[PDB]
Symmetry: C3
């Protein structure tokens, strides 16, 4: 909600309270888990008009979990999602730095439209696919104001030597090219980076270089939203062997994401989605499936502030999965107030 | 403070900074402790008018402690208090889900009017008495718009298998009936729930079923506030044996709460209160008193935003208490700014 | 940003997103470190006019780090900076209590004007020099409205027995006298306090009494800012022996701080600074230098909301420093949006 608009500076303080339960037989060995998954969000988007052609902006977004106790475990799952400041000059584009989405999310965001789940490949703190800390991102709209609908972007990821290999990364470069024409939208994205010492010393994942690329195709006009994503990764996707407490990365993944949705004028947005992600050359296993499901779901928009939703995952993963990826269905019911 | 009111949606961003010190001889073995107890609060209440009869709402409330360092211990006592979203339809009532107060607090809230302390039985993360995560709560005002002042409510608590027994719970149902007539107010509340495996395996507290009930009686008009609460609990109230580092639950408790207050037009709200809570059938002890005090205190309201207060506990607990409950007096002095 | 101003109460919700990287050869053994140092800030200043002569106020300020992951380490460096409520009566002055700056910062704040670094002696959770929890602070402007530009202040620090000696303190008193005349400003500040048991049992630092004093001199008008600080400390400044994993306090320190800055109408604020801090009588060492550098830096103010800055530390510390204080240079580049 815009709560300040004075003297060439507007601030938007926004947030949401999401009442959210997950139903699954077991959670312990299912897709999403079982129990209370209530959370709250808070953030600000700030925007200042320095002059006629120059513009400043900043954003911060925090996640508070509503499913912890007030005791010892009160912070589990609480985190900053976004924290970046940036400048935008006329048609020369924009530069920002901080915690933000990796460039490959420029692609993957295409299918990340599900009411609760979806966008399984957009892992956070995972190089270029999701949110990451320490990214320089240049972005260009309409090719310096000369070619309508053509957008490109470049991103520089500074190394993050963290205490765990899962959240660590080295120096890297990535980028994306995208074009949008009369409802349609085509996107390509790629990025490569160094693996840290701690990532190399991991039982799963072999190499010194991590890669992630993904294409995007979508129709998004006249109340219809269709979208497709294909992606591959070298030494990038994080994997866990639940049979041995082993973790690391998958040498190769192929990732398919399909999404179909519709928006009725009265408020209903039903959702059908397909998602499959296979991992190749997993040491002491071979070929494992990590994500495999059909999705049926809906979202009722009472208005721009209030909504409820059901999201049903038909989990195609089988009972004898090599890595121990939960094979059971998960259903999520939600009530959202946002501002 | 209402900081947004546009297009059938109002947001209220509120919070408070509370400068608060506790004085006690020792803290280590007193009622409230000794030292700095400064804290800050922040939250939002959001409310949207979807249509003539339908209404959406959300709330989130966070607690930041102002008595930690900026070093390692910076998060101790920081937590989400409330996080829930909900709908309200004309006179059919309202449903909300998330982190909220258990239904039995509908009763206990009657005596929870002390400037600092009081409401000792309204334990948080303790089934139905205080705040809990994962509660479905239906609420009805004036019996579907037909019987003025008569309110009932039902609550469904989903299981919380936490890492500690103190904060855990199983599936349960609870409810409350309440009636308010010309200043007066009568309330009854009850709730039962499964104890988790980890709660069963505890040295203190025997059973598979936890119960909590409490009645309420109050006068609240013409500047006078009087209130009374009686409650009992099976396998619900958490207890600790400070002589052996044992914890668990008390098989039975009887809980008495009395409160008398007055509000002078110039700002002063003095407070007298009585509170006693005895535990029965404590294994290897028998009958222990957990809470036992008289309370004298006051609160000066400079206005709706500014206040100061003294709260003096005359701790009736004795020096030879079986469980080690601190027997010393505690005094709390406070300065509050709120918005 | 002022987001509420109704009925004798104004609220100012403010914050900043700071994109910030540090460049150093190694970080491991440099002044500021190397890598992403992105952070975000959020806080409120609240102010109410109770009556013609009486005024209430409150403040809370939180620090969110933007350089952590969303995993296990998500809270590292997150903390409350300020949390205090207070009253101000006409010319009789003001009293506040909570987490706030120690009185000696009244002095040291003189040189704490650097774009990123500087103010090295204003350690937080360190008695009277920086931010601390549990301080009663009386403050007087213009000597009860009788002597223009003459300000004094007294502060009472309640003991903080924390889990670490670094963040702990005992009971203490401190104060400051300050005078400001036609651009110029002179300040003196002093404070003494008990060391806790845990501080006494530390290998470094000998005594039962900790002291901190500092003078201030500044010119601050006509776009020029010059400032000087001299300080000494008994048993107050925290030190670490990186050669043995020893920590504690320095028996004596002498602290020099010099700062020169200018503000061009078009937005540029260049900065030159000198900072030296020597420790005397360090057990098993003798005389060690803790902080020793020249500073060159600038800050571009696009406006009151947007800015960028470079801060270059020329680290005069040598390679054979006895305590292991990093001797390498550190450069910090920043992009700030604030509101």
């Amino acid at each position: 909600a815009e709560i300040y608009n004075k003297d060439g500076n507007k601030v938007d303080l926004y947030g949401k309270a999401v009442g959210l339960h997950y139903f699954s037989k077991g959670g312990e060995n299912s897709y999403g888990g079982n129990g209370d998954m209530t959370y709250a969000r808070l953030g600000f988007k700030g925007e200042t008009q320095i002059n006629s052609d120059l513009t400043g902006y900043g954003q911060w977004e925090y996640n508070f979990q509503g499913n912890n106790s007030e005791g010892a475990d009160a912070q589990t799952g609480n985190k900053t999602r976004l924290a970046f400041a940036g400048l935008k000059y006329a048609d020369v584009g924009s530069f920002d730095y901080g915690r933000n989405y990796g460039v490959v999310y420029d692609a993957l965001g295409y299918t990340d439209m599900l009411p609760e789940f979806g966008g399984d490949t957009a892992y956070s703190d995972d190089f270029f696919v999701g949110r990451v800390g320490g990214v320089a991102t240049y972005r260009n709209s309409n090719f310096f104001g000369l070619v309508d609908g053509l957008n490109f972007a470049v991103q520089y990821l500074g190394k993050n030597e963290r205490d765990t290999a899962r959240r660590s990364n080295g120096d890297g470069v990535g980028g994306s090219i995208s074009y949008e024409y009369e409802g349609f939208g085509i996107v390509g994205a790629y990025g490569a980076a160094d693996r840290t010492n701690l990532q190399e010393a991991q039982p799963l994942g072999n190499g010194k270089k991590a890669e992630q690329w993904a294409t995007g195709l979508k129709y998004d006009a006249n109340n219809i939203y269709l979208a497709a994503n294909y992606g591959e990764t070298r030494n990038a996707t994080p994997i866990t062997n639940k049979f041995t407490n082993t973790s690391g990365f998958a040498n190769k993944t192929q990732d398919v994401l399909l999404v179909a949705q519709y928006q009725f004028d009265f408020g209903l947005r039903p959702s059908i989605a397909y998602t499959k992600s296979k991992a190749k050359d997993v040491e002491g296993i071979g070929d494992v499936d990590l994500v495999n499901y059909f999705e049926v779901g809906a979202t009722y928009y009472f208005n721009k502030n209030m909504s409820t939703y059901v999201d049903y995952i038909i989990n195609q993963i089988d009972s004898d999965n090599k890595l121990g990826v939960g094979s059971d269905d998960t259903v999520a019911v939600g009530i959202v107030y946002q501002f």
